[PDB]
Amino acid sequence: TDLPRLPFDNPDIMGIAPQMLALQKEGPIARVGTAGEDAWLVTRYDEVRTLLADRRLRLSNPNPQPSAKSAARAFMVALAAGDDHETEPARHAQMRSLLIPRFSTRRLRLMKTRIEHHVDELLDQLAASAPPVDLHRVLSFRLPTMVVCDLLGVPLADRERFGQWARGTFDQSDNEHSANTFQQVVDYMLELVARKRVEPGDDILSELIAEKDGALSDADIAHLGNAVLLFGYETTIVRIDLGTLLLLRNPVQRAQLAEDPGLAPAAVEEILRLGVGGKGSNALIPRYAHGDITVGETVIRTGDAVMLAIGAANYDDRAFPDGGLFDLTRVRPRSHLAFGHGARHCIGRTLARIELTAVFERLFRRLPDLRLAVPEESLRWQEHRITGGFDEIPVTF
């Protein structure tokens, strides 16, 4: 008997920690220690998907004496309207009602066109440069920040101002840096709301300002803008990095994709399913039980913390045959859980898929000899950031 303690070691730079796969083999749910509270860890696909759809399991903490959280986690939960368990039902319902129509098919069609031309220009700059080059800086970082500038209706150079703010806000190692960074986010977005009130355009804040004939306060609108800024580029950056790394590890699939860019949608779904970095602490969706829930033969009691391991579940052999293998020829693969599921299912997931599809349609056809310029083992997953990520991806081509 030895209580497993999150985060688990991973000897590889990607994939699932061996101890978590070991727990998955024993059963769907295990009690584990963490850096803070003990929690139930749920690792099998069927159970994680069922619990994500169970509205007794919520983001907000119902306990009278809530355990302490990093400033970074507190900001993340507040941006998702989860900071007050008594008001989360109404506030979270309103948040989704106001954000979902911002990602209309009309907007997504226009953005797909602009995204595809942008990737073309990004890859032309890449192809013309002298290697070694940092692919993270010149490609992975640049497309999703371009997209957030488009959503917010600001000049592209603004991403040079806000491009490290998700990382800084979500730095769990430094509460002062996290709070100082979030203040910069807030000031920028309040500036932006005041501008869009007199100079609207075809963008998110302008639509929120017009919503319900102006019923929302500037603070309410800026809060929604902050969620889009802070949730809306960094995780996509990380998936371009992971997808590149995964395709580099699978040359037969990569050659298939280069020969037939029509496989990119399928490749993107495999990248999202298998794209887990380092110790994979970001591939856990945290929840609290607001009522008792039975999982197998285990009772989760009201107030218990629950970690839903979407990464481990996406590797589950019971849901994906040969779950550890990258295979963009899978016939009718189950829907992966990388965007979550249920009440908090990722709001930008169709836009994120358009970005990743546009990149991987193009990348290895534009740069067929692309490869790392450094050993894989030298790439360092940033465990202190809630969103993880690599800081650089040196390549030659």
Ligand X SMILES: CC1(C)C[C@H]2C=C(C(=O)O)[C@@H]3COC(=O)[C@]4(CO4)[C@]23C1
User: What is the binding site for ligand X (CB under 6 A)?
Assistant: 231, 235, 282, 285-286, 386-388
Nearer to ligand HEM, 110 or 374 (CB): 110
Which contacts of 66-72 are long-range, i.e. CB under 8 A and separated by 24 or more positions? Answer: 67/36, 67/37, 68/36, 69/36, 70/172, 70/175, 70/178, 71/175, 71/176, 71/178, 71/179, 71/182, 72/169, 72/170, 72/171, 72/172, 72/175, 72/178, 72/385, 72/386
Query: Which residues, 6 or more positions from 107, have their beta carbon under 8 angstroms from its beta carbon?
Result: 202
* Residue 277 interacts with which of ligand X, ligand HEM, none, CB < 5 to 8 Å by class: none
Rounded least distance, CB 339 to ligand HEM, Å: 5
* Residue 10 interacts with which of ligand HEM, ligand X, none, CB < 5 to 8 Å by class: none
Rounded least distance, CB 388 to ligand X, Å: 6
- In angstroms, the CA 152 to CA 206 distance is 9
- In angstroms, the CA 61 to CA 381 distance is 29
Token code pair at residue 32? 């584990």
Token code pair at residue 90? 């109404």
* Residue 387 interacts with which of ligand HEM, ligand X, none, CB < 5 to 8 Å by class: ligand X
Cis peptide upstream of residue 132 (ω within 30 degrees of 0)? yes
Nearer to ligand HEM, 181 or 235 (CB): 235
Rounded least distance, CB 132 to ligand HEM, Å: 26
* Residue 96 interacts with which of ligand X, ligand HEM, none, CB < 5 to 8 Å by class: ligand HEM
Which 3 state secondary structure label does DSSP give 331? coil
Nearer to ligand X, 362 or 385 (CB): 385
Nearer to ligand X, 8 or 364 (CB): 8
- In angstroms, the CA 249 to CA 273 distance is 15
- Phi, psi of 261, rounded to the nearest 5 degrees: -60, -15
* Residue 250 interacts with which of ligand X, ligand HEM, none, CB < 5 to 8 Å by class: none
Query: Of 77, 71, 235, 103, nearest to 166 (Cα)?
Result: 235
User: Applying CB under 6 A, which residues contact ligand HEM?
Assistant: 59, 80, 96, 99, 227-228, 231-232, 235-236, 239, 285, 338-340, 344, 346-348, 351-352
Nearer to ligand X, 184 or 382 (CB): 382
* Residue 385 interacts with which of ligand HEM, ligand X, none, CB < 5 to 8 Å by class: none
Rounded least distance, CB 136 to ligand X, Å: 16
Query: Which pairing describes strands 39-42 and 29-32: parallel, antiparallel, or unpaired?
Result: antiparallel
Query: Of 127, 356, 118, nearest to 240 (Cα)?
Result: 356
Rounded least distance, CB 189 to ligand X, Å: 17
Q: Is 346 annotated as a binding residue?
A: yes
Nearer to ligand X, 178 or 387 (CB): 387
Rounded least distance, CB 395 to ligand HEM, Å: 21
- In angstroms, the CA 348 to CA 240 distance is 15
389 torsion bin: left (phi>0), alpha (psi -120 to 50), beta (else): left
* Residue 169 interacts with which of ligand X, ligand HEM, none, CB < 5 to 8 Å by class: none
Query: Of 99, 57, 52, 70, nearest to 227 (Cα)?
Result: 99
Query: Which residues, 6 or more positions from 251, have their beta carbon under 8 angstroms from its beta carbon?
Result: none
Nearer to ligand X, 218 or 391 (CB): 391
Rounded least distance, CB 209 to ligand X, Å: 24
Which residues carry a binding-site annotation?
A: 346
Which residues carry a binding-site annotation for heme?
A: 346
